[PDB]
C-alpha cells in the first residue's frame, strides 16, 4: 500500500533509536511477519537493514534491532554512534509495489 515512517530523531551517542514504520492500509503480514528495514546513507547507495523487522543478521550490525506490530514497525537501534546514523527505509510487501519508507534519519548531537 503506502506507509509512513518516523521522519527524524535527534539523540546522543550510546542511545536507542526508535524508528516507527507506519503502514497505511495493509498491516504487516498474514503469515505474521512482513515489512522490512533499509538504509540509504547520504552520498551513498541504499543498503539493506532488516526484513520483517525481526530478522536478517550478520552483515547488518547488532545495533540494528526491533520489531513491528501490524502497521507500525519499530526499528530500535541501540548505542547510537555519530558516524553510524543515516537515512533509513522499510519496504512494504504482500500488496502493491513494495515501495519503501518516506526515509528515516536519526541525528546525534555532541
Amino acid at each position: 500500500i503506502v506507509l509512513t515512517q518516523s521522519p527524524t530523531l535527534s539523540l546522543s551517542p550510546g542511545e536507542r533509536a526508535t524508528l516507527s514504520c507506519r503502514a497505511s492500509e495493509s498491516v504487516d503480514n498474514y503469515g505474521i511477519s512482513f515489512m522490512n528495514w533499509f538504509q540509504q546513507k547520504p552520498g551513498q547507495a541504499p543498503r539493506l537493514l532488516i526484513y520483517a523487522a525481526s530478522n536478517q543478521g550478520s552483515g547488518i550490525p547488532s545495533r540494528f534491532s526491533g520489531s513491528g506490530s501490524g502497521t507500525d514497525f519499530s526499528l530500535t537501534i541501540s548505542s547510537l554512534e555519530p558516524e553510524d546514523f543515516a537515512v533509513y527505509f522499510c519496504q512494504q510487501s504482500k500488496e502493491v509495489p513494495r515501495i519503501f519508507g518516506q526515509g528515516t534519519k536519526v541525528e546525534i548531537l555532541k
Binding site: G57, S58, P61, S62, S79
Partner: protein, 48 residues
C-alpha cells in the same frame, strides 16, 4: 554422551541476562566485538 572429542575447551565467565541471547555464531554486539568473541564457524554447545 555418544560423541567423542579430541579437544574440549571450557571458558567460564559472567554476562548480563540480555547478553545471554547475544552469544551465538552470527550474533554480534558489544560482546562479540570487544570483550570476548564468538567463532563464526563456532560449533559446540553453550550453557548459561
Amino acid at each position: 554422551n555418544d560423541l567423542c572429542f579430541t579437544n574440549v575447551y571450557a571458558d567460564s565467565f559472567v554476562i548480563r541476562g540480555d547478553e545471554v541471547r547475544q552469544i551465538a555464531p552470527g550474533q554480534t554486539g558489544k560482546i562479540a566485538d570487544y570483550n570476548y568473541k564468538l567463532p563464526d564457524d563456532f560449533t559446540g554447545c553453550v550453557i548459561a
